[PDB]
Amino acid sequence: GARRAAAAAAAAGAFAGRRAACGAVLLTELLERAAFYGITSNLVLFLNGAPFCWEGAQASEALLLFMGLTYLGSPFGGWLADARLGRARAILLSLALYLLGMLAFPLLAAPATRAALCGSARLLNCTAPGPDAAARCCSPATFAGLVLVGLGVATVKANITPFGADQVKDRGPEATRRFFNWFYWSINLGAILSLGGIAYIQQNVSFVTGYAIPTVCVGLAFVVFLCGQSVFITKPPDGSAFTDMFKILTYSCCSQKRFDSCKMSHGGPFTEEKVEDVKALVKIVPVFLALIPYWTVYFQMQTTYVLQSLHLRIPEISNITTTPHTLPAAWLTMFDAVLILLLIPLKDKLVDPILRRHGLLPSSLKRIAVGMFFVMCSAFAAGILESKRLNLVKEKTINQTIGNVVYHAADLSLWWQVPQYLLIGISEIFASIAGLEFAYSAAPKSMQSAIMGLFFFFSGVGSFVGSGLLALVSIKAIGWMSSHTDFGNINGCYLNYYFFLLAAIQGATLLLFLIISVKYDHH
Amino acid sequence: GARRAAAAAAAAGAFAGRRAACGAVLLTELLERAAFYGITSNLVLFLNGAPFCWEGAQASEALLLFMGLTYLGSPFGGWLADARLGRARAILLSLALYLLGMLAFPLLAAPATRAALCGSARLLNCTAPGPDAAARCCSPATFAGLVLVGLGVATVKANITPFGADQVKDRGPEATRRFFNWFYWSINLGAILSLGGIAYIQQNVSFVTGYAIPTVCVGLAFVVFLCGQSVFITKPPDGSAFTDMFKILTYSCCSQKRFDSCKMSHGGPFTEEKVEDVKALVKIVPVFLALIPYWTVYFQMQTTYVLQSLHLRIPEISNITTTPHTLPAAWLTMFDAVLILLLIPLKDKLVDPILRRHGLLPSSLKRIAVGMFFVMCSAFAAGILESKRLNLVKEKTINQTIGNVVYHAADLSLWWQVPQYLLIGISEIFASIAGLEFAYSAAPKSMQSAIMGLFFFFSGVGSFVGSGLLALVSIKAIGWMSSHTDFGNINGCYLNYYFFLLAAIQGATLLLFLIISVKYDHH
C-alpha cells in the first residue's frame, strides 16, 4: 500500500520541467485532428454539390477508399518512421505531405482555380439540363489530393503517439497513462472545434472559406512542431540501427521457413534481444485479433447513433435565436466528443488516484474489458429506445428538416439519447486510452511505431468488417435494413434488432478478450 | 501447468472408496428437497380450497411467514449443530422434528382426522351459504405444523451441506467442488420429481394422497441417514469444545466494549486461533452483504418468470393425449430445474477440466461474478420479450386455462422463454455452487455451520428485500404494477420496465461485488 503512495510522487510529478514539449505535441495533435475532421465532415456533400456533380454512390466510395487508405498507411508509416529515418523527421515529412495534399481542396473550391484545374471546366450544375454526362470529374487532382492527405494522416497517426509517449518515458507508467489521457482530451477538443466551426462555416457560409481553415490548421501544426523540434530533445530514437531489427524479424520468420523460435535462435545469430522482440510480437498479435470485433461494434454503433438521432425531435426551439438555415449534421457526432471532454478531466483528477489508492486496476486489459462491458450496456440501452420509437412512430409524424432533406421523426426528444452516449463515453475513457497505453507498453523499444500502425490497421479492419456486416443485414432475406436506400428512412426498418445483435457480439467479444488477456498475463 | 495435471489425479480420484456416504447424503438431500417442494408447491391453494376456507391474503401471509421462519432458523440451526451437539445428531434431530411437523398436513387432509382435530369442524364450503364467518380456522394445529416444519428444514439446510463438504475433506478443493456440483444436481433432481409428481397428484387426484407422499419421503430420508450413520465416520466433528469458541467470539466483541482485535488479543488470553477465526468472520460478512442484492434480483426474477410464462401460449396441443384437467402450475417453475439438470453433468464432465487445464478460474468469487453477469444478460433478454408481448397483446387475445382461472394470453409460444431460463441456468451453475463452496472454504473449521446459516439468512433477507421492492413498484405513483390484485393480469401492467430495473440493479451489484472480491482477495 505504501508503494502506491511512493508512486503518487511520480504521478504528481509526471509533468516536470518538460511541459513545453508536451504542450507542443498536444497542440500539434489537436490541429491535425481539427484538419482531419474538417476534411471528413462534409466530403460527400461537397462532392455532390460541387460543379463536378458526382453520384452519391461515387462520393461514398471515394470517402470509403480514403478511409481505407488512412487505415492501411499506418503500418507502412511506422516502418518508414523506425527505418531509414527518425521519429521527428518522419512527423515533419508526413505533415509536409499532409499540407501539400490538403492544399488542393481550397483551390478546387475557388471557381477561378477550379476552372484553371482539371482541364475540363465542368459546370453542368447537377440538375441543370445537359447533353448527357461524364464520369467522376476532376479525377486526377482530387485523387492525388486524397491519396496524399490519406498517407500523411496515416503516418502522423501512426507516429505521433509513440513519440509523445516516449517523450515522458523518464517517469513511470503512470506518467504515460496521464499523458495518454490528456492526449485523448486534446483529440476530442480538436474534434469538437472542427465539427462545430468548420462544419458551420462550410454548410452555412461558403466552401471556399470553409476548406481554407484546415489548411491554416495544418500549417500551424507544422510550424509549431518545427519550432518545438529545437527544444524537444525527448531522447530522440534516431533510427539507423533499427533497420537491422526489421530484417532480423524476416530472419526469424525464415527460421520457421528453414518455443521453437527461441530454441533455434539461441546458438543461432538471432541474439536474445531479437528473440524477445519476436516473441513479444507473436504474443501481442492475438490481442489485436481479439480487439478487432470491439472496433467493429464500436464503429458500427458510432455510425448508427447519428442515424438514430436524425429521426428524433430537434430540441432548443430549433435554435430560435439566429435561426439555423440548413442546420449542420456534425453536432450529432459532436455530442460524443462533448461528453468525452466532460468526462476525461474528472477521470484523470479523481478516478485514477482513487483506483490507484488501495489495490485497484494496474493493467490496461481489465480497463479494456470494463469499457467493452459499458459498450454492451450502451448497446442494450440504445436497442430499447429504438424499439419504443419504432412503436411510437406508428402515430402521427412531424416533418423536420436537417440540412436540405425533409426527415420524418417521432414526437420524442433527442435528449433521451443522453444515457447511451454517456455510457459510450465512459467506455472510451476506459477502453481506447488503455489500449493505446497497451500498444505502447507491450511493444518492443525498437519498433513501437510499427506496433501502433498495426493497431490502427486492425481497428480499420474492424470498421470494414462492421460496414460489411451492415451490408449483410441490409439483405431482403433478413429485412432489417430494406428501405435504407437514401439518407435515411429508419421509420420503415428495424434497428433495435441490429442494436441487440451488436450487444450480443460485444458480450461474446468481451468473454473472448477476457480469456485472451488472462492467457497473455500468464505468459 | 504440470501442477494442474497433478491435481487432476485428486480431481479424478475424488470419489475414493467412500462413495456410499456421498450417495447416502445426496439421497437424503434429494428426499428432503422433494418433501419441501411438495409442501410449498400448493400450500396457498390447499389452504384456500380446504374446508377451513381462509382468505387469499391470509394464505399468502402464512406462506410468507413460513418462508421467513425457514430463512431465520438457519443461523440458530447451525449454532445448535456446532454447540452442545454434533453435526449428525443435529441432522437426525432436525429430520425427526421435520417428520413430526409435516405429519400434521395429511391428517388435516383426511376428513375424519380433520373433523377430529381443530375442535371446530369447519365445513362452510367457502362459497356455500353461511351465517357470517370466523377467522383462520385450524389455527393451532396448522401453525404448530408450520413452525415445526420450518425449523426442521432450516436446520437441515444449514447443517447437511457443510457435513457433506467435510465428508470429502480428505482430498483437495476440487473434490469439494465436484461434490457441490453433484449436490446441486441432486437438489434439482429432487425438485423436479416433487414439482412434477406431487403437484400433479395434488391438483388432479386428491390432497389426501398428495400430502401423504412427502411424509413418506422424509421418513425415507430419516431412515437412510440413520442407516448410513454407522458407515459414515466422515471424521465427525463431535462438537463439544466448539461451544467454547462461540463464547470467545463474544469475548472478542468484549474487546470492542472494553487490527485492533489482533493487537488486543495478542496480549489477551484470546489465542491466535480465535483471533484468526474472528478476523475471518469480519472479512466474510461484507461478502454476504454484497451478495444480498444478488439474492434479491435472483428471487424476484424467479417469481416474475412464472407470471410472464402464465400469459404465453400453452404448447404441445395442450397435452392432447390424456387431457390435463386443471393443468398444474408447477411445471413452469420446473423448467429452470430441468435446464439445470441438463447443464450440470455437462459442466462437471467438460467445462471444469477445460477451465482447470491451462490457467483459468481457481476462485469462486470470479465464478459468482460471471453468474451475475449472466443474470443481467438474462434480465435484459426477459425485458425485451415482455416489451414485444405488451405490444403484441394489443391485438386479439386467447382465453387459456391453467388450474381453474381463465388467463388472458397473447398469441406467442411459451418456447420463446427458452433463452432467458437457459442463461439463468448457466448463471446458477456458475454462481450458487461457487457461493456454497466459498461459504464452506472461507469459514473457520470450528463454525462452518454457523457461516452456512448466515449465508442462508442473508439470502432470505435478499428475497424479502425483493418482495418489498415489488410492493414498492406496485404503488400507483409509479403505476408499473397497478392491476396486479389477483393471480395475475400483467396484460395491463408494464413488466418490461421492471425487468430492466432488475437488470440495472444486477449490473451495479456486479461491479460492487467485483470490488469487494478484489479487496477480500488482497487481504
Ligand SMILES: CCCCCCCCCCCCCCCCCC(=O)O[C@@H](COC(=O)CCCCCCCCCCCCCCC)COP(=O)(O)OC[C@H](O)CO
Ligand atoms: C466467427 C464469426 C461468425 C459470424 C459472425 C457474424 C454475425 C453473426 C450473427 C448474424 C445474425 C444474422 C441475423 C439473425 C439470425 C436469424 C435470421 C434472421 O434474421 O431471422 C429473420 C427471419 O428471416 C429468416 O429466417 C431468413 C433466413 C436467411 C438466412 C441467412 C441468415 C441466417 C444466419 C446467417 C449467418 C450465420 C450465423 C450463425 C450464428 C452466429 C427474423 O427477422 P423477421 O423476418 O422476423 O423480421 C421482422 C419482420 O418480420 C420483417 O421480416
Ligand SMILES: CCCCCCCCCCCCCCCCCC(=O)O[C@@H](COC(=O)CCCCCCCCCCCCCCC)COP(=O)(O)OC[C@H](O)CO
Ligand atoms: C442504496 C439503495 C438505493 C435504493 C435501491 C432501490 C431501487 C432503486 C430504483 C428505484 C426505481 C423507481 C422507479 C424508477 C424511477 C423513476 C420514477 C418512475 O417510475 O417514473 C415514472 C413516472 O412517475 C413519476 O414520475 C412518479 C414519481 C414518484 C416518486 C417516487 C419514485 C422516484 C424514485 C424513488 C426511489 C429513489 C431512487 C433513486 C435512484 C436510484 C415512469 O413511469 P410512467 O408513469 O411513465 O409509466 C408508464 C405509463 O405512463 C404509466 O404511467
Ligand SMILES: CC(C)CCC[C@@H](C)[C@H]1CC[C@H]2[C@@H]3CC=C4C[C@@H](OC(=O)CCC(=O)O)CC[C@]4(C)[C@H]3CC[C@]12C
Ligand atoms: C466478429 C466476426 C466478424 C468474427 C471476428 C473474427 C474472429 C474469427 C477472430 C477474432 C479473434 C480471433 C482469435 C484471436 C486469437 C487466437 C489465438 C490463437 O492461438 C495462438 O495463440 C496463436 C499461436 C499458435 O498457433 O499457437 C488461435 C486463434 C485465436 C483463438 C483467434 C481465432 C479467430 C478469432 C476468434
Ligand SMILES: CC(C)CCC[C@@H](C)[C@H]1CC[C@H]2[C@@H]3CC=C4C[C@@H](OC(=O)CCC(=O)O)CC[C@]4(C)[C@H]3CC[C@]12C
Ligand atoms: C453497470 C451499471 C451501470 C448498470 C448497467 C445497466 C444499465 C447501464 C442499463 C440497465 C437498464 C438500462 C435502461 C433501460 C431503459 C431505458 C429507457 C430508454 O428510453 C426509452 O426506451 C423510453 C424513454 C422515454 O421516452 O421516457 C433509454 C435508456 C434507458 C434509460 C436504459 C439506460 C441504461 C440502463 C440503466
Ligand SMILES: CC(C)CCC[C@@H](C)[C@H]1CC[C@H]2[C@@H]3CC=C4C[C@@H](OC(=O)CCC(=O)O)CC[C@]4(C)[C@H]3CC[C@]12C
Ligand atoms: C443526466 C442523466 C444522468 C439523466 C438520465 C437522462 C436524462 C437526460 C432524461 C431523464 C428525464 C428526461 C426528461 C423527462 C421527460 C421529458 C418529456 C418529454 O416529452 C415528451 O415525451 C413529449 C414530447 C412533446 O409532445 O413535445 C421530452 C423530454 C423530457 C423533458 C426528458 C428529457 C431528458 C431527461 C432529462
Ligand SMILES: CC(C)CCC[C@@H](C)[C@H]1CC[C@H]2[C@@H]3CC=C4C[C@@H](OC(=O)CCC(=O)O)CC[C@]4(C)[C@H]3CC[C@]12C
Ligand atoms: C483476406 C481475408 C483475410 C479477409 C480480410 C479482408 C477484409 C479487410 C475484407 C473482408 C470482407 C470485406 C468487406 C466485404 C463487404 C463489404 C461491403 C461493401 O459494400 C458495398 O460495396 C455495398 C454497399 C454500398 O454501396 O455502400 C464495401 C466493402 C466491404 C465492407 C468489405 C470491406 C473489406 C473486408 C472487411
Ligand SMILES: CC(C)CCC[C@@H](C)[C@H]1CC[C@H]2[C@@H]3CC=C4C[C@@H](OC(=O)CCC(=O)O)CC[C@]4(C)[C@H]3CC[C@]12C
Ligand atoms: C453474438 C451473435 C453471434 C449471436 C447472438 C445474436 C442475437 C443477438 C440475434 C441472433 C438471432 C436474432 C433473432 C432472430 C429473429 C428474430 C425474430 C424477429 O421477428 C420476430 O419476433 C418474429 C418471430 C417469428 O418468426 O415467429 C425479431 C428479432 C429476432 C428475435 C432476432 C433478435 C436478435 C437475435 C437473437
Ligand SMILES: CC(C)CCC[C@@H](C)[C@H]1CC[C@H]2[C@@H]3CC=C4C[C@@H](OC(=O)CCC(=O)O)CC[C@]4(C)[C@H]3CC[C@]12C
Ligand atoms: C457452463 C457452460 C455452458 C459454459 C460455456 C461457455 C464457457 C466455455 C465460457 C462462457 C463464459 C466464459 C468465462 C467468461 C469470463 C471469464 C472470467 C475471466 O476471469 C479472469 O481470470 C479475470 C482476470 C483476473 O481474475 O485476474 C477468466 C475467463 C472466464 C472464466 C471465461 C472462461 C470461458 C467461459 C466460462
Ligand SMILES: CC(C)CCC[C@@H](C)[C@H]1CC[C@H]2[C@@H]3CC=C4C[C@@H](OC(=O)CCC(=O)O)CC[C@]4(C)[C@H]3CC[C@]12C
Ligand atoms: C439493493 C438495495 C436494497 C441495497 C442493498 C444494500 C446496500 C445498501 C448494501 C449491500 C452491500 C453493502 C456494502 C457491503 C460491504 C461494505 C464494506 C464495509 O467496510 C468494511 O470493510 C467494514 C469494516 C470497517 O468498517 O472497516 C463498508 C460498507 C459496505 C461498502 C456496504 C455498504 C452498504 C451496501 C452497499
Ligand SMILES: CC(C)CCC[C@@H](C)[C@H]1CC[C@H]2[C@@H]3CC=C4C[C@@H](OC(=O)CCC(=O)O)CC[C@]4(C)[C@H]3CC[C@]12C
Ligand atoms: C456474453 C454472450 C453470451 C452474449 C450476451 C448477450 C446475449 C445473451 C443477449 C444479447 C441479445 C439478446 C437477445 C435479444 C432479443 C431477444 C428476443 C426476445 O424475444 C422477443 O422479443 C421476440 C421473440 C420472437 O418472437 O422471435 C427473446 C430473447 C432474445 C433472443 C435475446 C436473447 C439473449 C441475447 C442474445
Ligand SMILES: CC(C)CCC[C@@H](C)[C@H]1CC[C@H]2[C@@H]3CC=C4C[C@@H](OC(=O)CCC(=O)O)CC[C@]4(C)[C@H]3CC[C@]12C
Ligand atoms: C435452443 C436455443 C439455443 C435456440 C433459441 C430459442 C429457440 C427455443 C427458438 C428459436 C426459433 C424459435 C421458433 C421460431 C418460430 C416459431 C413460430 C411461432 O409462431 C408464431 O409466432 C405464431 C403463433 C401462432 O399463430 O400459432 C411459434 C414458436 C416458434 C416455433 C419458435 C419456437 C422457439 C424457437 C425454436
Ligand SMILES: CC(C)CCC[C@@H](C)[C@H]1CC[C@H]2[C@@H]3CC=C4C[C@@H](OC(=O)CCC(=O)O)CC[C@]4(C)[C@H]3CC[C@]12C
Ligand atoms: C432492521 C433493518 C436492518 C432492516 C432490515 C429488515 C428487513 C428484513 C426488512 C426491511 C424492509 C422489509 C420489507 C418491507 C416491506 C414489505 C412488503 C410487505 O408486503 C405486504 O404486506 C403488502 C403486500 C401483500 O399483501 O403481499 C411484506 C413484507 C416486506 C417484504 C418486508 C420484509 C422484511 C424487510 C425486507
Ligand SMILES: CC(C)CCC[C@@H](C)[C@H]1CC[C@H]2[C@@H]3CC=C4C[C@@H](OC(=O)CCC(=O)O)CC[C@]4(C)[C@H]3CC[C@]12C
Ligand atoms: C441501478 C438502479 C438503482 C438505477 C437504474 C434503474 C433503471 C433501469 C430505471 C430507473 C429509471 C427508469 C425509467 C423511469 C421512467 C421511464 C419512463 C417510462 O415511460 C415513458 O417512456 C414515458 C415517460 C414520460 O412520460 O416522460 C418508460 C420506462 C422508463 C424509461 C424507466 C426505465 C427503467 C429506468 C431507467
Ligand SMILES: CC(C)CCC[C@@H](C)[C@H]1CC[C@H]2[C@@H]3CC=C4C[C@@H](OC(=O)CCC(=O)O)CC[C@]4(C)[C@H]3CC[C@]12C
Ligand atoms: C469514469 C467514471 C464515470 C466512473 C464512475 C464509477 C466508478 C467509480 C466505477 C464504475 C465501474 C467500476 C469498475 C467496475 C469493475 C472493475 C474491475 C475490477 O477488476 C479487478 O480487479 C479484477 C481482478 C484482477 O484484476 O485481478 C476492479 C474494480 C473495477 C475497476 C471497478 C472500479 C470502480 C468503477 C471504475
Ligand SMILES: *[C@@H]1O[C@H](CO)[C@@H](O)[C@H](O)[C@H]1NC(C)=O
Ligand atoms: C450554376 O450556374 C450559375 C449561373 O450560371 C453559376 O453561377 C454557378 O456557379 C453554377 N453552379 C455550379 C455548382 O457550377
Ligand SMILES: *[C@@H]1O[C@H](CO)[C@@H](O)[C@H](O)[C@H]1NC(C)=O
Ligand atoms: C361441501 O359439501 C359437501 C356435501 O355436503 C361435502 O361432501 C364436502 O366435503 C364439502 N366440502 C368442503 C371443502 O368442506
